[PDB]
Design a protein around this ligand. Structure first.
Ligand SMILES: *[C@@H]1O[C@H](CO)[C@@H](O[C@@H]2O[C@H](CO)[C@@H](O)[C@H](O)[C@H]2NC(C)=O)[C@H](O)[C@H]1NC(C)=O
Ligand SMILES: *[C@@H]1O[C@H](CO)[C@@H](O[C@@H]2O[C@H](CO)[C@@H](O)[C@H](O)[C@H]2NC(C)=O)[C@H](O)[C@H]1NC(C)=O
Ligand SMILES: *[C@@H]1O[C@H](CO)[C@@H](O[C@@H]2O[C@H](CO)[C@@H](O)[C@H](O)[C@H]2NC(C)=O)[C@H](O)[C@H]1NC(C)=O
Ligand SMILES: *[C@@H]1O[C@H](CO)[C@@H](O[C@@H]2O[C@H](CO)[C@@H](O)[C@H](O)[C@H]2NC(C)=O)[C@H](O)[C@H]1NC(C)=O
Ligand SMILES: N[C@@H](Cc1c[nH]c2ccccc12)C(=O)O
Lengths: 463, 469
């Protein structure tokens, strides 16, 4: 009784595309223009972010091909190094950043879906919370139903995102065709507020936000047909398309709106729709809202198969491993993920989670690349069909060090506390792993609880 | 390992009742989902609705900047428009939404048959130079309003002789300048025009007949309220700059009475706030009141119109060489050639730039704060009574960030004395609010302040900011 491989090349591309393009393209332009005054500088930094993501995805593809074990960073960084760092990584994923990701995306979806009913007014917070919770519940039910439905929904919503982006591009091209000037003189020429470390690194840091989410294919490895060749092909097909679409969309934005308008307004897509559409320009946020919906689904998918992997190594309670005998989906893992995604609705504030994620996400990738280099040094011919030159990984490590330094410079006190939380997993690690010969009553209670959960939810062990 | 295998689980889980329990939980989950959806629908339907937008124009979103003497704006010896083309960056930094050229046509003396309103004076610039200046201004999103006064070198506003031919010349020139690309017109000293109401109505009708974004400014020299109302009887949409606020200065409640009476009489329409039609603020105010008035004019429901050099407190009574009607802009120590060294840094524009406490920094901060919030853009205005020597009001559009301005016109310090918040409307006054900036040294910003124990030093203004309640 094992999860059969169902994801194909098209679904593999769809997962990456729907995870990467969820919200950044519709919001970030304002920030990148605030940091980089010149629109040409913004386009240049967007291209730099794109090529940096290309480099990271390239090496990541090889890293995944070498170690075909399921699970993402929690597997590659567990095989290298030792058991202790892997549990810290998984505990950090379980605690804050991963569950908060779905809730934030769902809240954005709710707000931008209810925006047409409240154009100028701020949407009520209760309605947004209820709609986000409804979305999470529906999506975690659909995921528990069957894998094929989830793949179909992800493909459909990726297609919807591409259609919306193409509509934006064609509207921009049409307004160019009407004797436009492309704002060429403000473009490039004077940079504005450029600085050696003051502003360009801040613009780069803002730009890398919208390019995140490409590290998801590993989270679904061992469930796709022929992972040896389909995994790198999906990445090399998805990433350049996303980069060119981002560049073209930013170019379309900059030409049809004044710089001050973006520097003052927040929803650039809404203003674009109001200016061009001029009629029923209320669906624009709706599409954008849909552009978030599918994203959540993808995240939930890539969340569940992560925790399940942990349950195989013994780090997690053995309840998560069991799967439904007929449906073949990991119901307890999805229920657990949905519960801790819901639990973040009760928080009065939600932007406090960025302070730790901002540097954790970019230090873990560097740790993984160092692990890949260590694996290359330790023993060769560990089934490495690709065998990329050892030039990209070192440059990526150097760039990640600069990003960590920038994060330290920006939010020192915030970054400090974030890391402190990391140490909180040590007592849990000792109580769960280092401590095994527990009193009989504890084992009896744990066994009874797992038996009860197995009796309610019909799930059989992996083997 | 810590659980039943497949065979044991399928043997035990098949008992009756256990099959029904999971089905019951599934139906309960679906029922809870439907209940959540129904609750969301109820919250959505039973909620307040938005207010209607006032159809924002281009001249409601920022102040206006006047240039009485173009020659003295960039110093003597350079009267071409290229100076303005190069200096547009300064005004863009000031973030004004308009620019009023002075009269540039030919006007030598009272010769009516020789003065022409269409030909461009060579010393000021050329026709293609004007086109280039207009193009550069439009690229910078700075819109140009051009002045049309046939006589500005003699004694009469228009001409001492019959004025009908003057009106014919003006109506001939309206289109000649409109198809040139200007974004508005201005006429001054209309108090010398016989039956000026009909002429103003005709010009307003003609200007609106080309497009909707066209604007007309009229300037008078009379502070009488009844005369202004009579002038606006048939020119409701016209913007009338006048000397209304110039009648009294440093008055604690007389200014409040003037503003409230004017707003009540005009019907709460859109108006223009300025002490004079073409003169500087320091000609009617001392150096200790500039900050208070610059704070007041940026938080009133209307368009503020300022003269050039009045964002740094330029004085026409501090240097004998400069004439009072045409002051010379202070760009550096070499700007004013006579008696070198008399110019000080704190009156120099370069000296007012880096200093955070300078007037220019205050003007820039107010300009930034004027054109982003809707409360200060098109929000409702409510003034309430306070202690003597104080003027207190509130700005609130529908739901956005509420602003509360308190000014101390008294010559001595006293407490706030906010007493009862008259006419709070929907925007209730909380006991806690922020303090964005202050007009006097001290009073560190960003921290919340308690209003019931506000001690106001003489000649101070506060711009408390508090959110929706
Ligand atoms: C000309 O300007 C006048 C100033 O108000 C406008 O007065 C109109 O006069 C015409 C016919 O005499 C009619 O439209 C109405 O009697 C007036 N309408 C209004 C709104 O005042 C007029 O709109 C302008 N153009 C016309 C049509 O004369
Ligand atoms: C014109 O501005 C000055 C400012 O006080 C005043 O001068 C008057 O001008 C009018 C018209 O020439 C004449 O009555 C006299 O020359 C001045 N008399 C007055 C009233 O002081 C006057 O206030 C303004 N014009 C008016 C009449 O309001
Ligand atoms: C101008 O507005 C004032 C406002 O005080 C009017 O005086 C009155 O005071 C109340 C309270 O504000 C006003 O609402 C009423 O309109 C007035 N009623 C009384 C008690 O007389 C004044 O009448 C207004 N003038 C015009 C032409 O409307
Ligand atoms: C400089 O700022 C001062 C503000 O104090 C103004 O004139 C000054 O007046 C004080 C005493 O009244 C003295 O510092 C000097 O008389 C003036 N300042 C200096 C440094 O000379 C005015 O704003 C500016 N005056 C000058 C001439 O600098
Ligand atoms: N960039 C994604 C958001 C996102 C998904 N997964 C992420 C991981 C890290 C940073 C951002 C994300 C979007 O466009 O909505």
């Amino acid at each position: 009784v094992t999860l059969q491989r169902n994801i194909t090349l098209l679904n593999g591309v769809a997962i990456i595309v729907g995870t990467i393009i969820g919200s950044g393209i519709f919001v970030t332009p304002t920030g990148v223009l605030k940091e980089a005054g010149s629109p040409g500088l913004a386009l240049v930094v967007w291209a730099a972010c794109g090529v940096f993501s290309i480099v990271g995805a390239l090496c990541y593809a090889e890293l995944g091909t070498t170690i075909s074990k399921s699970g993402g960073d929690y597997a590659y960084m567990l095989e290298v190094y030792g058991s202790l760092p892997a549990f810290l990584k998984l505990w950090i994923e379980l605690l804050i950043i991963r569950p908060s990701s779905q809730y934030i995306v769902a809240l954005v979806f709710a707000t931008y879906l209810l925006k047409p009913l409240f154009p100028t007014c701020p949407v009520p917070e209760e309605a947004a919370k209820l709609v986000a919770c409804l979305c999470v519940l529906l999506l975690t039910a659909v995921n528990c139903y069957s894998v094929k439905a989830a793949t179909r929904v992800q493909d459909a919503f990726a297609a919807a995102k591409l259609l919306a982006l193409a509509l934006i591009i064609l509207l921009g091209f049409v307004q160019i065709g009407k004797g436009d000037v492309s704002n060429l003189d403000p473009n490039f020429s004077f940079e504005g507020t450029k600085l050696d470390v003051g502003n360009i690194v801040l613009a780069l840091y803002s730009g890398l936000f919208a390019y995140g989410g490409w590290n998801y294919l590993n989270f679904v490895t061992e469930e796709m047909i022929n992972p040896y060749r389909n995994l790198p092909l999906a990445i090399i097909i998805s990433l350049p398309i996303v980069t060119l679409v981002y560049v073209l969309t930013n170019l379309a934005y900059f030409t049809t709106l004044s710089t001050e308008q973006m520097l003052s307004s927040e929803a650039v897509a809404v203003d674009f729709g109001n200016y061009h559409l001029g009629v029923m320009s209320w669906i624009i946020p709706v599409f954008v809202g849909l552009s978030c919906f599918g994203s959540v689904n993808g995240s939930l998918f890539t969340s569940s198969r992560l925790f399940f992997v942990g349950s195989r190594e013994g780090h997690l309670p053995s309840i998560l491993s069991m799967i439904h005998p007929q449906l073949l989906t990991p119901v307890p893992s999805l229920v657990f993920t949905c519960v801790m995604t819901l639990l973040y609705a009760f928080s009065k504030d939600i932007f406090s989670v960025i302070n730790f994620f901002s540097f954790f996400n970019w230090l873990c990738v560097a740790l993984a690349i160092i692990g890949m280099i260590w694996l290359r040094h330790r023993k060769p011919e560990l089934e490495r069909p690709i065998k990329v030159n050892l030039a990209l990984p070192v440059f990526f490590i150097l760039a990640c060090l600069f990003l960590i330094a920038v994060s330290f410079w920006k939010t020192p006190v915030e970054c400090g506390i974030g890391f402190t939380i990391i140490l909180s997993g040590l007592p849990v690690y000792f109580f769960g792993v280092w401590w095994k010969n527990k009193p009989k009553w504890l084992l009896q209670g744990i066994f009874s609880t797992t038996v009860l959960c197995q009796k309610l939810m019909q799930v059989v062990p992996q083997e | 390992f810590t659980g039943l295998s497949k065979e044991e689980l399928l043997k035990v889980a098949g008992s009756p009742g256990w099959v029904r329990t999971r089905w019951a939980l599934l139906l309960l989950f679906w029922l809870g989902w439907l209940g959540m959806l129904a609750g969301a629908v109820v919250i959505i339907v039973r909620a307040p609705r938005c207010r209607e937008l006032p159809a924002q124009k281009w001249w409601h979103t920022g102040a206006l900047y006047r240039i009485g003497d173009l020659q003295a704006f960039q110093g003597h010896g350079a009267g071409n428009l290229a100076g303005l083309k190069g200096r547009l960056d300064y005004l863009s930094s000031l973030k004004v939404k308009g620019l009023v050229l002075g009269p540039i046509h030919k006007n030598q003396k009272d010769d009516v048959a020789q003065t022409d309103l269409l030909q461009i004076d060579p010393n000021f610039g050329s026709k293609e130079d004007f086109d280039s200046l207009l193009q550069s201004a439009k690229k910078k999103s700075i819109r140009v309003i051009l002045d049309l006064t046939p006589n500005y070198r003699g004694e009469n506003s228009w001409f001492s002789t019959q004025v009908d031919t003057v009106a014919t010349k003006v109506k001939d020139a309206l289109e000649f300048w409109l198809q040139a690309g200007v974004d508005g017109f201005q006429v001054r000293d209309i108090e010398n025009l016989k039956d000026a109401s009909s002429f103003l109505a005709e010009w307003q009708n003609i200007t609106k007949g080309f497009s909707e974004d066209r604007l007309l400014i009229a300037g008078t020299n009379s502070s009488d309220l009844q005369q202004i109302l009579s002038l606006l009887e048939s020119n409701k949409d016209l913007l009338l700059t006048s000397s209304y606020l110039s009648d009294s200065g440093s008055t604690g409640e007389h200014t409040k009475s003037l503003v409230t009476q004017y707003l009540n009489a005009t019907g709460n329409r859109w108006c223009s706030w300025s002490l004079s039609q073409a003169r500087l603020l320091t000609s009617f105010l001392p150096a200790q009141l500039l900050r208070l008035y610059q704070l007041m004019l940026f938080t009133l429901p209307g368009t503020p119109v300022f003269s050039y050099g009045d964002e740094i407190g330029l004085d026409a009574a501090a240097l004998p060489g400069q004439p009072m009607e045409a002051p010379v802009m202070l760009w550096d120590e070499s700007s004013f050639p006579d008696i070198p060294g008399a110019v000080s840094a704190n009156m120099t524009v370069k000296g007012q730039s880096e200093d955070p406490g300078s007037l220019l920094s205050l003007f820039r901060r107010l300009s930034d704060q004027r054109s982003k919030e809707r409360s200060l853009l098109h929000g409702d205005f409510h003034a309430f009574s306070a202690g003597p020597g104080l003027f207190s009001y509130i700005r609130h559009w529908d739901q956005n960030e509420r602003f509360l301005v308190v000014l101390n016109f008294g010559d001595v310090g006293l407490s706030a004395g906010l007493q009862a918040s008259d006419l709070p409307a929907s925007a209730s006054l909380p006991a806690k609010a922020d303090l964005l900036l202050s007009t006097q040294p001290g009073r560190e910003e960003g921290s919340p302040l308690e209003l019931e124990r506000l001690k106001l030093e003489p000649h101070e203004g506060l711009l408390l900011r508090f959110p929706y309640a």
